[PDB]
Amino acid sequence: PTIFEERHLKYISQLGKGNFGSVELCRYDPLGDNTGALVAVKQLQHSGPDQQRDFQREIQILKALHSDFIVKYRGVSYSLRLVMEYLPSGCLRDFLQRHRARLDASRLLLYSSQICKGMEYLGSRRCVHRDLAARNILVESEAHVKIADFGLAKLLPLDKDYYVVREPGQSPIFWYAPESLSDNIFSRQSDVWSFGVVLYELFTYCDKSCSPSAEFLRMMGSPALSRLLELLEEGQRLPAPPACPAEVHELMKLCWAPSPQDRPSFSALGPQLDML
């Protein structure tokens, strides 16, 4: 099952690109009569040595994760390719923009709860995502979302609860916490910072004009990394989204606490979301 033969993976269409590589919709059909299962196949076409090493790490991390709110690993094909389950409604960013009129606050709260449970589990496995955002969240159906794109994901060292990355910025800066911007320090607490921005994204329906980049860029005014750092250290944050519940906005601000240890854990965030 885990060893997918390359000749049986029949290409259908393109899906998109994560942090590195690209993903394709394929039908794995060994019987050769297109009666097989649709799957999501990731590969690296135009990639350096650094991205190849990250990909080997992504495969092993995702293979080991088992949650209802984390995209399932199916197997591998060797030209190394990662086979994942296919979620036909796509990513949440586009889903919220497309179906803005139909999706009320209670539904946004359900996605927040499911993502939080996924991240709580990811914390128990001592794994840091490093790129938690609406673009990397997939949609199974109207009542079910999963976390995806584990390319930048790291396991914490056996003796520490934080990871210092040597590389600078493989993702957009507007989801990073202060200690990641200033010192490249990543942890479960920096993932909680990013969850606050995801909460902001949900409750703006990923509207482009009031996105994290759009809002912060106006504050930064006429180095982009250093200016963002200054704003965050001075106490500047994303505003309350229009028509956002007050209780949800207070949780965002707790997720954006200056010190990592003052941010709540995903285990403490879970009940607070579910009781609204």
Ligand X SMILES: CC(=O)N[C@@H]1CCc2ccc(Oc3cnc4[nH]cc(C(=O)N[C@@H](C)C5CC5)c4n3)cc21
Shortest distance, CB of residue 142 to ligand X, whole angstroms? 15
Binding string to ligand X for residues 76 to 115, with x set by CB under 6 A, is what?
--------x-xx--xx--x---------------------
For residues 86 and 71, give the distance between their C-alpha atoms in angstroms, rounded to a whole number. 9
If one asks whether residue 16 binds ligand X (CB under 6 A), the answer comes out as yes
The helix/strand/coil state of 161 is coil
Q: How far apart are the first and last CA of the chain?
A: 42
Closer residue to ligand X in complex, CB, 14/265: 14
Query: Is the Cβ of residue 29 or residue 94 nearer to ligand X in the bound state?
Result: 94
Given 131, 149, 191, 274, which residue is catalytic? 131
The answer on whether 184 is annotated among ligand-binding residues is: no
Among 77, 113, 136, 204, binds ligand X (CB under 6 A): 136
Residue 24, Cβ density class (10 Å: 0-12 exposed, 13-18 middle, ≥19 buried): middle
Q: Does 65 bind ligand X (CB under 6 A)?
A: no
For this structure, is 149 an active site residue? no
Q: 244 — phi, psi (to 5°)?
A: -80, 140
Please tell me the number of Cα atoms within 13 Å of 82 on its side-chain side: 28
How many whole angstroms separate alpha carbon 40 and alpha carbon 18? 12
Active site residues: 131
Binding interface with ligand X (CB under 6 A): 15-18, 23, 40, 42, 71, 84, 86-87, 90-91, 94, 136, 138, 148-149
